[PDB]
Design a binder for these strands. Structure first.
Ligand SMILES: [Ca+2]
Ligand SMILES: [Ca+2]
Lengths: 126, 239
RNA sequence: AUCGUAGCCAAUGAGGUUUAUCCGAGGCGCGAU
């Protein structure tokens, strides 16, 4: 009842989800956020993504499963959070968001937090 | 890898396009040559297949119009009598045996081409519904195959954003319009609702493509759902 | 059209004259001017 698609790998725990959503909110405030699977795709193809966050309850999940494949291509960290409602809430948007991308910005006041999250993600992807 | 199916289907689907081009070059030819015999007939029978069937049925003898059971399988009884009337007050004149051979051969070839188009599309519909069933349900097999061709297959297509899939096959005609814009489903709408319809259809095609790229929802559940969603938006835009 | 927008749609993409294999958060209804 009902959770959670095994294919939504890697999945953040409660503590990491909180960090991710915080940083996604900041990224938004600092103009470093792309909202939406389509725009995420564009960031990856262009090599301007710091990391990708996707929603585990996207239905069907395959509408974003191209992203991990793209990320593997580009050596780019990606993670899943449980709730698209929460991600959209963190994206400063008034509808769910199934995927978003924090973008590379030279001199970003957020370099340190972004770098930190990348490590957090990387250690789940082993 | 190594001779993938989609390419065979893309090129089969392309044949029907070539077949249509020949088919209306033949129509144009037949209407031009038959005009010596019955110049009026073309404006009474606009539809290309009916026309071709009609000149094939009639030939030189325009009094084959009355009580002709074979004609009744081609034309409306009402349009029969309007052409029968127009037949006597006529203008045109008889053709030579060589002028008839010319038309008869062209009519038989056109009929033959028309049946081949159908038999090739059957193949294309059959195989597309295995390769990309959810995509095919939304835009038809023909449009699905066209965009899959230019994208270089399903995996490539699936990693494109909806806004570029919208512009696949784009070309002095109409700016920013792709295969999707010119699909039966979009074109079925009033002109002023088309750009918006292409956007919607492009967006859902992208979603369907991704599902197909992973070989999920193989009975088309996702495609029929998106199709229903699109239809309900089209209804809501119109009156 | 602008301002107000407690109802509807919308990142699963709003709406796209410009830059369209490119852009990315508005539109509708409603009230006032
Ligand atoms: Ca890695
Ligand atoms: Ca008919």
């Amino acid at each position: 009842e009902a959770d959670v698609n095994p294919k939504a790998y890697p999945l953040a725990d409660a503590h990491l989800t909180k960090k991710l959503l915080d940083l996604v909110q900041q990224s938004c405030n600092y103009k470093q956020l792309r909202k939406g699977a389509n725009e995420a795709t564009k960031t990856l193809n262009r090599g301007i993504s710091e990391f990708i966050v996707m929603a585990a309850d996207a239905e069907p999940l395959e509408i974003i499963l191209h992203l991990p494949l793209l990320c593997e291509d580009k050596n780019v960290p990606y993670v899943f959070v449980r709730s698209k409602q929460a991600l959209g809430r963190a994206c400063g948007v008034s509808r769910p968001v199934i995927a978003c991308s924090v973008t590379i910005k030279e001199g970003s006041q957020l370099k340190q937090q972004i770098q930190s999250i990348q490590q957090s993600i990387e250690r789940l992807l082993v | 890898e190594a001779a993938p199916e989609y390419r065979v289907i893309v090129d089969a689907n392309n044949l029907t396009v070539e077949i249509e081009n020949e088919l209306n070059i033949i129509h144009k030819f037949i209407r031009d040559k038959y005009s010596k015999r019955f110049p009026e007939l073309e404006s009474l029978v606009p539809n290309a297949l009916d026309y071709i069937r009609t000149v094939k049925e009639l030939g030189n003898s325009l009094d084959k119009c009355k009580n002709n059971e074979n004609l009744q399988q081609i034309l409306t009884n009402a349009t029969i009598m309007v052409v029968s009337v127009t037949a006597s007050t006529t203008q045109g004149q008889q053709l030579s045996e060589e002028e008839l051979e010319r038309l008869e051969e062209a009519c038989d070839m056109a009929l033959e081409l028309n049946a081949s188009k159908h038999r090739i599309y059957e193949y294309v519909e059959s195989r597309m519904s295995f390769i990309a069933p959810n995509l095919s349900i939304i835009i038809g097999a023909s449009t699905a195959a066209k965009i899959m061709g230019v994208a270089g297959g399903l995996t490539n297509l699936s990693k494109m954003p909806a806004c570029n899939i919208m512009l696949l096959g784009a070309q002095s005609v109409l700016p920013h319009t792709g295969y999707i814009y010119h699909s039966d489903i979009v074109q079925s709408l009033p002109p002023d609702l088309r750009r918006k319809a292409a956007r919607l259809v492009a967006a859902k095609c992208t979603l369907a493509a991704r599902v197909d790229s992973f070989h999920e929802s193989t009975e088309g559940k996702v495609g029929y759902e998106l199709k229903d969603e699109i239809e309900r938006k089209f209804d809501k835009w119109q009156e």
